[PDB]
């Protein structure tokens, strides 16, 4: 992004953690996505389950 418009904008991203509940993801592929879809028909479990 900085290269596209040279402006030397560092776009600093600091890191933190608080009471926020984070999203949930686990990688799937063509050989397993439909099965994860069957699992997700019933909702999704808690973070880090």
């Amino acid at each position: 992004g900085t290269e596209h418009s040279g402006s030397t904008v560092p776009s600093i991203l600091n890191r933190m953690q608080t009471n926020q509940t984070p999203p949930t993801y686990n990688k799937t592929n063509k050989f397993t996505h439909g099965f994860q879809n069957i699992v997700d028909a019933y909702g999704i479990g808690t973070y880090r389950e």
Binding site: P10, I12, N14, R15
Partner: protein
């Protein structure tokens, strides 16, 4: 620490940009003040010149 140097980088961007903006506003206002002096000196030049021609 990369985080602390990054905080310093954010600071050096922020203060520098804000200084540049403030100085820019200052010079624009000063230029307007200079033209204010100019319009003013013109008005009173007219006010004086009238009586000057009269008396001479």
């Amino acid at each position: 620490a990369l985080s602390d140097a990054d905080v310093q980088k954010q600071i050096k961007h922020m203060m520098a940009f804000i200084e540049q903006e403030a100085n820019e506003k200052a010079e624009e206002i000063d230029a307007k003040a200079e033209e204010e002096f100019n319009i003013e000196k013109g008005r009173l030049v007219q006010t004086q010149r009238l009586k000057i021609m009269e008396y001479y």
